[PDB]
Every structure is written in C-alpha cells, then in structure tokens.
Design a protein around this ligand. Structure first.
Ligand SMILES: *[C@@H]1O[C@H](CO)[C@@H](O[C@@H]2O[C@H](CO)[C@@H](O[C@@H]3O[C@H](CO)[C@@H](O)[C@H](O)[C@@H]3O)[C@H](O)[C@H]2NC(C)=O)[C@H](O)[C@H]1NC(C)=O
Ligand SMILES: *[C@@H]1O[C@H](CO)[C@@H](O[C@@H]2O[C@H](CO)[C@@H](O)[C@H](O)[C@H]2NC(C)=O)[C@H](O)[C@H]1NC(C)=O
Ligand SMILES: *[C@@H]1O[C@H](CO[C@@H]2O[C@@H](C)[C@@H](O)[C@@H](O)[C@@H]2O)[C@@H](O)[C@H](O)[C@H]1NC(C)=O
Length: 204
C-alpha cells in the first residue's frame, strides 16, 4: 500500500543488439525523459563506456523515471508504447522494455485481447519501482528497478554497486539473485555518484 511515491527511480535497461539510446528514449518517455534526453539519461550513467556503435550490447544503463503510487496499492510508473506490425506482449515486455515489465502487467492494465493485440495501439506499460524502506536502511532513497537475468548473481551485482551483499539481500529478502528472472531493487547513485539518502541531510 502507498499514498505517495518519489520524484525519481531508475530503470535498469539491459541493452541488446539493435537497441540504441534513441530507442530507449522513445520507449521510456516521461516527464523526466523528453524528446532530447541524451544528457539527462547519461547524467545517471557517467560510468558507462560507449563503443563505435554507441551503447555496448549486453551491458546496462539506468534510465530515470518518476515513481508514482498506483491505485494506492503499489509503486510504479505507466509508460506508453505504440504497437507496430508483429508486436505482442512477449516482444513488448521482454524485448522493448528489457523485462522491466511483465506480460501479466501488460494484460492487467490494457483492455486488448492479450492474444491478438492490434497495430498502432497505445499500450500501458507498467514498471514497478521503490522509494526505499526505512526499516532496512535510512541511507538510500533512490532505487534501481533491476530485472535479473540468466548470468546475474548477488556477488556481481553487489560488487558493481559498491554495496555489501547482505544489504542488497536485505532489501530483497525473498529473492534468489541467481534464479535468472524477476525484479529486485538495488540502491542507486545520483548524477554525482553518491547514494541519495532516504531523508535529506543537506541544509536548506
Ligand atoms: C530504434 O529506432 C530506430 C529509429 O527510429 C528504428 O529504425 C527505424 O525503423 C523504421 C521501421 O521500424 C524504419 O522505417 C521505414 O519504414 C517505412 C515504413 O514504416 C518504410 O517506408 C522504409 O523502408 C523505412 O525503413 C526506419 O527507416 C528506421 N530508421 C532508422 C534505421 O534510422 C528502429 O526500428 C527502432 N527499434 C525498435 C523500435 O526496436
Ligand atoms: C491505459 O490506462 C488508462 C488509465 O491509466 C486507461 O484510461 C482510462 O480508461 C478508462 C476506460 O475507458 C476511462 O474511463 C478513464 O477515464 C481513463 N483514465 C485515464 C487516467 O485516462 C486506458 O483505457 C488504458 N488503455 C488500455 C488500452 O486499456
Ligand atoms: C536459485 O536459483 C538457481 C536457478 O536454478 C533454477 O533452477 C530451476 C529451479 C529452474 O526452474 C530455474 O528457475 C533456475 O535455473 C538455482 O541454482 C538455485 O537452486 C536457487 N537457490 C539458490 C539458493 O541458489
């Protein structure tokens, strides 16, 4: 249950061949990610290296998005995607949105026949998020929505994040980080590389 969300969450977007920033920007348009979003997206990815093509296949980039309370029930954000010929919920969930949504969420929040979705149709694409949990730690107020994949492990995730494995597990107590699917929440760094805390400790 929720009443309010938070201004920013990060979506861990796993890059496959044929996906570049222009596609990610199109899929992830929001009040934060506008038509010309390169600087805003890349400001949360100052660690990321490009190759001659742009984004390197099979790496991740963190995409900022607003985190709303949906129906007083759960935290997430509804993106909008317009279908093209051949699209189905599998392609939308697991290719375009890189498993940041699920076929179940696409069925739940769209009126289309889930087995025959039309072309040039607007799709509500729900991506969950977190604004933290003071019972785990007060030190983190920005979270990455991180869909696990076949080669992920807790050890690699924790090392890359610069955080203790036990803390990451504590934020996701029921998750098996080696299971190869499902979403976990990882504390995220701001544009300066610092962990934005749950409660502000900067002077006004
Ligand atoms: C990622 O973004 C790029 C740039 O928008 C997409 O490439 C573009 O794909 C479209 C069709 O999906 C190409 O369409 C054109 O098609 C019309 C019919 O719609 C036809 O008259 C032409 O044959 C033409 O190819 C478009 O040229 C192409 N633009 C590029 C490559 O600069 C790409 O599809 C996106 N990837 C996704 C959505 O997965
Ligand atoms: C996508 O979700 C929106 C809600 O976020 C749906 O829009 C609602 O549609 C109902 C039913 O027609 C209307 O009565 C409401 O006024 C709409 N609400 C808002 C906030 O716009 C929309 O139908 C969904 N799309 C699909 C294809 O199911
Ligand atoms: C964590 O998950 C790992 C993945 O194994 C799973 O194996 C079966 C259950 C498949 O259905 C698929 O979901 C996964 O490939 C396992 O190695 C391990 O048993 C699980 N638990 C632990 C503690 O690692």
């Amino acid at each position: 249950k929720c009443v309010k969300g938070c201004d920013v969450a990060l979506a861990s977007y796993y890059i496959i061949p044929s996906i570049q920033l222009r596609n990610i920007s199109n899929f992830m348009q929001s009040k934060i990610v506008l038509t010309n979003s390169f600087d805003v997206i890349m400001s949360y990815n100052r660690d990321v290296v490009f190759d001659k093509s742009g984004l390197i296949s099979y790496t991740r980039i963190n995409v900022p998005f607003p985190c709303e309370c949906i129906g007083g029930e759960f935290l997430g954000h509804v993106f909008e995607y317009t279908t093209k010929e051949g699209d189905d919920y599998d392609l939308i969930a697991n290719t375009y949105y890189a498993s940041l949504t699920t076929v179940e969420l696409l069925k739940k929040f769209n009126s289309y026949d889930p087995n025959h979705i039309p072309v040039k149709a607007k799709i509500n694409v729900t991506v969950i998020c977190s604004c933290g949990n003071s019972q785990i730690s007060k030190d983190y107020g920005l979270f990455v929505t991180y869909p696990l994949r076949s080669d992920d492990t807790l050890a690699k995730i924790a090392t890359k994040a610069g955080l203790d494995e036990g803390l990451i597990q504590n934020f996701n107590q029921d998750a098996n980080f080696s299971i190869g699917s499902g979403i976990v929440f990882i504390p995220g760094r701001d544009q300066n590389g610092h962990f934005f805390p749950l409660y502000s400790r900067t002077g006004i």
